[PDB]
Amino acid sequence: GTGYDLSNSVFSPDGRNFQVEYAVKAVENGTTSIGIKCNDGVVFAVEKLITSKLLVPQKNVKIQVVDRHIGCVYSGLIPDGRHLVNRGREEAASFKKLYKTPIPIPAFADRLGQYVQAHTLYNSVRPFGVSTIFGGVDKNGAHLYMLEPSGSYWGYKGAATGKGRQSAKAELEKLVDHHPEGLSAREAVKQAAKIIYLAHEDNKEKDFELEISWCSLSETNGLHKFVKGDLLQEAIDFAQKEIN
Amino acid sequence: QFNPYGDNGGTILGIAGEDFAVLAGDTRNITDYSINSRYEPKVFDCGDNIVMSANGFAADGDALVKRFKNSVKWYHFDHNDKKLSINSAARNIQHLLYGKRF
Amino acid sequence: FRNNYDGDTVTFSPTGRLFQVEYALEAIKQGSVTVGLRSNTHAVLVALKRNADELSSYQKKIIKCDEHMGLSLAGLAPDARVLSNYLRQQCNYSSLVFNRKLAVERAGHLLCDKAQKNTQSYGGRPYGVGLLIIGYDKSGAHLLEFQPSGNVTELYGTAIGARSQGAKTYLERTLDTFIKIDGNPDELIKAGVEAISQSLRDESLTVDNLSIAIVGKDTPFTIYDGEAVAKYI
Amino acid sequence: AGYDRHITIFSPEGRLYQVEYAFKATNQTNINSLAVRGKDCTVVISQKKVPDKLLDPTTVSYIFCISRTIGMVVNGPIPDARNAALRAKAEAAEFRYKYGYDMPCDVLAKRMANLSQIYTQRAYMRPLGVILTFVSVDEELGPSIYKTDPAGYYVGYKATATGPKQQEITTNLENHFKKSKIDHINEESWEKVVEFAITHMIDALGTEFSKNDLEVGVATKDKFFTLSAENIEERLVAIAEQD
Amino acid sequence: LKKGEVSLGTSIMAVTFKDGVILGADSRTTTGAYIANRVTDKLTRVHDKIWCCRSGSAADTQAIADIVQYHLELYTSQYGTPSTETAASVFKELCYENKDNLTAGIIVAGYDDKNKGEVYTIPLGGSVHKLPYAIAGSGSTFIYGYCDKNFRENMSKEETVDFIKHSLSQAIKWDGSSGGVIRMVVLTAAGVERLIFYPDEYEQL
Amino acid sequence: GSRRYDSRTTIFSPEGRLYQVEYALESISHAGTAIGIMASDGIVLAAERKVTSTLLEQDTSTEKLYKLNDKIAVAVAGLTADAEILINTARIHAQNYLKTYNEDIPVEILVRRLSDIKQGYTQHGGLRPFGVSFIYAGYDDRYGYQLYTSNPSGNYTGWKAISVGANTSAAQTLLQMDYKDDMKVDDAIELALKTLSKTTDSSALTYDRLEFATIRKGANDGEVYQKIFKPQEIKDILVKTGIT
Amino acid sequence: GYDRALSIFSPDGHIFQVEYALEAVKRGTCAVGVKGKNCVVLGCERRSTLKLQDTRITPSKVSKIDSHVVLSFSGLNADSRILIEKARVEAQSHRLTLEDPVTVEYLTRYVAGVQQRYTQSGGVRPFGVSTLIAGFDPRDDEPKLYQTEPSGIYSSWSAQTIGRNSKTVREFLEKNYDRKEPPATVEECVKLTVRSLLEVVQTGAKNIEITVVKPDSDIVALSSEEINQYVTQIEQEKQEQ
Amino acid sequence: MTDRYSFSLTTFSPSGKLGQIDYALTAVKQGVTSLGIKATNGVVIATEKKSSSPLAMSETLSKVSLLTPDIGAVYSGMGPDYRVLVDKSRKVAHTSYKRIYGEYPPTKLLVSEVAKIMQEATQSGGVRPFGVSLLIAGHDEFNGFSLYQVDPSGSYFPWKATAIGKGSVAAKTFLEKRWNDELELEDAIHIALLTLKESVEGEFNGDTIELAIIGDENPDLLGYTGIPTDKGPRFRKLTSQEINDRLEAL
Amino acid sequence: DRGVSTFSPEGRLFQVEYSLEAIKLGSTAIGIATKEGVVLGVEKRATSPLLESDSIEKIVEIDRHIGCAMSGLTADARSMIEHARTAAVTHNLYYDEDINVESLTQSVCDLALRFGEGASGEERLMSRPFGVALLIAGHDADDGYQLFHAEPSGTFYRYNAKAIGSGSEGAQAELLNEWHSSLTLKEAELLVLKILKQVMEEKLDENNAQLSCITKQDGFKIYDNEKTAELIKELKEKEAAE
């Protein structure tokens, strides 16, 4: 027949859920954002699109942190991931409440993928319109994960989502080749900044703001934290030079 | 067994003025023979020129008084910042108290 | 297609969109206009109160959820009332549990996440109102806009509802002026006064038409209606 | 009416197309995998495909260790895989908890099959479009092979494969097994058995495989585990010798 | 301890040493003056290198342990080997929660690679303490002075052993409830090793 | 959304009808013809075993005539399965009623009991009704023998005699023709058998094609005695009709 | 668990389920009642589509909710039963709770909401039954006549009919009944009833069934003979001209 | 989430029909032809073990399964449906009967009980009827041997013998031809072989075919000794050997 | 079909939107808030002479200080009426006082949206909006007399006077001119009753219409037929002057 898409849990005649696939639509539409696992740790980079001067700088913050070691960022409908994020914040809490440890990134990774996939399991459950790049330093190093409304996430040497991901995925692939060694968080900070501007070239039509956060076994000790001030401004001009 | 109650000591005195009204108790809080706090203000304005104090196990009255001012807030919300009549609160608080009846 | 994809909150467009949301978002525009802006010292709510008739009164678009916090609305009132009450609890809850005035930003998160339920959850609907919320706190004055999509934003100034765009431009047009106006709510008001006048189209705001609310540094969340607004009319 | 397509109810022919469509999402990931009982052991070989550098390849597996003893490889959407594995993982411990001993492999499959059967009959539940493959060395059964479908249907296997070219691999082994007449490989060392399979995997796929190319797992007495790329390459070494 | 279930007591002690931790306990289980089962192992594996000294209600411990074992196994089946600490956290929960229904003290001990051996006591209070060594059960009473004076960190494997062997023997000697045989369990990177000792030896030390 | 899938069972026709009820009735037309008669001295129960065969085992087989109580047994027109549900329930209900009052249930009470139960699906639940209707044969203290009926709608009546399943109108005609108030059971027996043989859609009316029963206060009695006839007995009385 | 909302405002703001229930009401065999000066009488046509029934054990289209209060209806005999039920509980409840049987209105208003509820209730359809309620209040002889309908709306009637053709007989009744003069005599009230009845019933005695509430829980149903005697008389006076 | 299909999924046709059931019957008819025969001394049931691949190990799939030492079952249809029903059937038997009466229910009640389930699927929302029908044979003390056939209608009735699945018509045809009352099981066994042979297309042997009986109690199978009252299960499953043994006896 | 909470492509609620239809289908009901009091009057709209208009009340008393009238599908209000009355009592139960008419009114309109099928974010169990609209008149110490129009939208306004039901709008227009703050309860009676008779299909009488007031002194007070008939006749006299 037809209209298989018209209800979530339905399998398409080819066995697919177009709703999720449609949810994927706005995901791309979601603000381009990336993440990087550097040598010790991970870095989370996202463009903050400036809609207007009435927006107050730095105030509306995209990247969200789970526990204290896990940052998360997503292209898509903000309230979605937020809603999800809270659940993750719940998850780790329960996890840590039970396990006394902060949660391993992959552990944390898994739990969500279920909860997302749960929203693939019912025609009444609206899949998620977001894909979160997320991770942090954990017991064993860091990890870099981006979870799809499909309920699929993976380990990522680098990760990107939203519009400009291609420009990103380009640059990420490069740095992989530029630095199969690894990367210093600092350069991880710096390079992402360039990538973002480059990624912004798709959305170049409007001005934006740049938000980048990171989790460094070294620099944040394994905490997850924002890039701020000079170091933030550094990568900016570092990129703002390199963009030219 | 854990006792749900205790006493923090300190006597409170209400007096209705004709035109005015006044209420007082000590500032002394104690436990048994140990003084909790020589200065422990026990009496509280809840708003609308209406003051309240609960003498007994403090935390009870404490949370209570808290809960009461909470009620006040919603009253003004729902009654559109109408002043709460001193009697009404009593009728109200009675529920709060009797809400714990058992 | 529409009837296919516009029917259920739970169902994306082939483009991955929620028309009920979009429709719920539409009703915002249908709703009357309200305006808001903040200084660092103060935040201002400016509403145009709409009636059914002159024999009727002007529906108030403004709500106080707290001493540091209250809101304005353009959209379906009851949802806000639901949410405002919900919010009020939270502030009071924060006040109860933490003895803590609810952080305006942190406040928006809940509602942002709250309606987010309606979005992904079958059987319900998003709230029929977009929301402007001001609060003053330890982080100072704040102006937060809400979207029935859940999306919340902190602004210097803004307006919502019918044709709020003009002042919205004018506000953006006027940006750095009022935000610098500090401790002078009056101009902050009169700015918003001139603002709401911008998106005033049919009529001029009147004593009853206009509604004003303010929280500020030492200014608790308060509302100015009628004679209160008179000097600013 | 035509919603029968959309939901799970008998077609006018008495058919469940959501199920049959879920059979699509099986090979959708396009991984040709196999499982063979060795002599004492059981080995699963599968394609490990990495599309992107930016990925973590190591994070990419459809072979999941359900128990100490039981590993499982999945064919279908990774989320359902990530979903189903946990479900299984929940069972064994609880089985182990309830029943004092680790769940024998089939029981899991039997157990898991029910869920699909539930999803099969339940409407609001969609089934999962994954085919599951359960092997381990069962203390009673030694090597054992069990494969479940979205239908809640499953069976034992002397050996089995899964994937788009599963059909051919099936033939290859059937031929080989008919040739051998024996259900399991005679080879004692799974090492050989791995190489044996990879051979027949390379064979029936006509396709050579590098260390990254393959997802591999090893069912041993009391333990399941998966090989490294080295072990893979190690096997890849000797296969290059015999062949 | 409920009416009608067997009482553990005996004497449990776990001691970290230079190569890890070794666990030991008496084998004696008693209902009142009657010794229910003299040979009973009170040393228990929830997890490969993570282990426990069970005191309090045997039923409790026996019941509790698998539950932890369950979750850990599940946890491991998810996330792999937890910290010996994390394992303790599990007990604590049930302990701290069901303390009102639970009479069990538990010494939780497990070998970590990074942490080498570890010891975690959970008395009936449900509190948790990581310790260089720990003792519990009835006979533990007698040996504190002995243990403390005689304990040292990073002793040998065997130095610990006899330090263990003597300590328990005292408890076994002094405590009635402590006795049967000394079961010892080895936790190192080397692996898990159970050791038994017959009275005709450790009674004489 | 779930709405797509609801047949919306309980919704009214524009004419205020419930088609499921209508269709349930319709399947009942397809149901094997079942007849019952309240004689003066008793109540007769005869129904056609429908869809029969050689290796079909008759003796244990009862697809139609079931006994709720020793004063209440019933004939079933509809899905065999569905009734057995209600059958069991009513028994309990009666048993409860018995266990409540230590007294047998006046039939209608049990009847009305099931009546509204059917009606339960009628007015709520989105649940299909039962495709079953019943002949309620019962003896009470109050009215003595009582012959009731029910429809999936739960509407129900008393009868001096009644038929259900196929050929009802035909039977009803024959019945409403040949019946007379004072008829003795044995008359009604053959009368039904007469009606049966005639209303029989198959060639011959034969025991192996029939279920048969009677409620009668025996000659030595004070216990009003229900009896289901054995196939032979049916076959025997089949001869006594001259039908042979 | 089934919440689905059947009763919904039409594009033009109607609930057809309600409106269709009205049809089963119309489809329902006509029912009528009239209140004499001291009394009330309830006529009902026995569904005549079938016969040979045992009418004794077959329930009457009219039923007593309480000794002083009865109800009749038109619609699905099923839907009534539940309605019939809860009201019976209700009176007893009111009896128990209030130390007093209901006022006819009280249960009436009660029953109305029940319907009226199922309207804006979800997951259920409304009843398909409209009802006529009869009774004399505790310590009040006064005739109380109430008409309810699946929409859950009630009202008092000098006289009322419901079911099929009710309009027809209503027109008869509207003119034939006079408020200024209730048919004080039960019989004349019964008479006027049966007169109105044959206007629809189309010539039957058994087809007709009658019930009368008198004060103080005095409630009586009439035999066909009593009926026919009126039938006879009524015919004559008609024939006479 | 939160299943909102509470509404009966199968609804009476304008013709007064339940299509899913009909389609179940359709699917049931599609089922592998499977038979049962109630003889004097006992009852036998039979079906072809279906191999969708020789790599698959047929024995690992059992279409015939003991419900009680005197009762076992077989189907024609979707294996999985049959699978779960077995457990419930097994369970409800213990619970609703044994855990009450300490024994194994008379064939009818369990059957009556089982069918009850299948009906429920037909009626309750969110669920579909099962893709099988069931040939069920059991011996009880009082009713002795009996053989039942349950549909997705949840309807069930006894047989002298019967078959379900595809060739069942042809089978039942030949069955009626062959069947008499006085058939002893072995001939009936042999008969079934003959009969199912027709329904059999590919290889016909104990490895292709599944046979079991309701026989006399089997003390060997009792797994223990010393109890006079319990002489063991009447049910048994037949070995490919025993099968192929009697397939010589063809 | 289509969901009940489904927004219009304009962002409106169809059922709510449609609910407004049966509102206009409701009898025309009118009231005037004065400083003296609040006059209420409503359309009996008897469907038959045998129908006794006595048993028709679309005017109801919530409490002495607060009462209301209905126009729409009536028995829907019963819950609301019962609900509303409770709240005041409840309020009084808690607050030992009368409730602000608004506070009550506001509370009532919270019933509005509570229809939904397992709605997202809360459990509000009702199938559909209420099929009735409410004129609500109460006297409160704060606001004196007031008149609010309750709506299935959950929205309500204050009104100098209001006309709801069938002939509302025209009658409304009438109110627009006729009303002034200085109107008197009697005048308002006259005005309503006249404008009723205006919009009424049948010739207005005490039987085919119904009257009542709410007066701070006496709170809610119904007008009997007789006083009604006088005012009627009074109008008939006053209505016929020039």
Curated annotation (Swiss-Prot), chain A:
**GO cellular component labels:** nucleus; proteasome complex; proteasome core complex, alpha-subunit complex; proteasome storage granule
Domain of life, per lineage: Eukaryota
**Is Mitochondrion a UniProt keyword of this protein?**
no
Other comments on record: Present with 12000 molecules/cell in log phase SD medium.
Role of this protein: The proteasome degrades poly-ubiquitinated proteins in the cytoplasm and in the nucleus. It is essential for the regulated turnover of proteins and for the removal of misfolded proteins. The proteasome is a multicatalytic proteinase complex that is characterized by its ability to cleave peptides with Arg, Phe, Tyr, Leu, and Glu adjacent to the leaving group at neutral or slightly basic pH. It has an ATP-dependent proteolytic activity.
What protein family does this chain belong to?
Belongs to the peptidase T1A family.
Protein name in UniProt: Probable proteasome subunit alpha type-7
Curated annotation (Swiss-Prot), chain E:
Q: What are the UniProt keywords, alphabetically?
A: Acetylation, Cytoplasm, Hydrolase, Nucleus, Protease, Proteasome, Threonine protease, Zymogen
Organism superkingdom: Eukaryota
Give a Gene Ontology cellular component term annotated to this protein: proteasome complex
Q: What is its main location?
A: cytoplasm
Q: Give the catalytic activity.
A: Cleavage of peptide bonds with very broad specificity
Q: Subunit info?
A: The 26S proteasome consists of a 20S proteasome core and two 19S regulatory subunits. The 20S proteasome core is composed of 28 subunits that are arranged in four stacked rings, resulting in a barrel-shaped structure. The two end rings are each formed by seven alpha subunits, and the two central rings are each formed by seven beta subunits. The catalytic chamber with the active sites is on the inside of the barrel.
Instruction: Identify this protein by name.
Output: Proteasome subunit beta type-1
Q: Which organism is it from?
A: Saccharomyces cerevisiae (strain ATCC 204508 / S288c)
UniProtKB/Swiss-Prot annotation, chain F:
| Cited PANTHER family | PROTEASOME SUBUNIT ALPHA/BETA (PTHR11599)
Quote the record's miscellaneous comment.
Answer: Present with 17100 molecules/cell in log phase SD medium.
Cross-link (Glycyl lysine isopeptide (Lys-Gly) (interchain with G-Cter in ubiquitin)), chain numbering: 99, 198, 230
Q: Name one GO cellular component term.
A: proteasome core complex, alpha-subunit complex
Record's subcellular location: Cytoplasm; Nucleus
Under which name does UniProt file this protein?
Answer: Proteasome subunit alpha type-3
Checking SUPFAM superfamilies in the record gives: N-terminal nucleophile aminohydrolases (Ntn hydrolases)
Q: Which NCBIfam families match?
A: PRK03996.1
**Do the record's keywords include Ubl conjugation?**
yes
UniProtKB/Swiss-Prot annotation, chain I:
Q: Which UniProt keywords apply?
A: Cytoplasm, Nucleus, Phosphoprotein, Proteasome
- Does the record carry Nucleus as a key word? yes
InterPro entries, alphabetically? Ntn_hydrolases_N, Proteasome_alpha, Proteasome_alpha-type, Proteasome_alpha_type_5, Proteasome_asu_N, Proteasome_sua/b
GO CC entries: nucleus; proteasome complex; proteasome core complex, alpha-subunit complex; proteasome storage granule
Protein source organism: Saccharomyces cerevisiae (strain ATCC 204508 / S288c)
Put simply, this protein is called: Proteasome subunit alpha type-5
One GO BP annotation is:
proteasomal ubiquitin-independent protein catabolic process
Q: Where in the cell is it found?
A: Cytoplasm; Nucleus
Q: Nucleus: is it a keyword of this entry?
A: yes
Residues with PTM Phosphoserine? 48
Q: Whom does it interact with, and what assembly results? A: The 26S proteasome consists of a 20S proteasome core and two 19S regulatory subunits. The 20S proteasome core is composed of 28 subunits that are arranged in four stacked rings, resulting in a barrel-shaped structure. The two end rings are each formed by seven alpha subunits, and the two central rings are each formed by seven beta subunits. The catalytic chamber with the active sites is on the inside of the barrel.
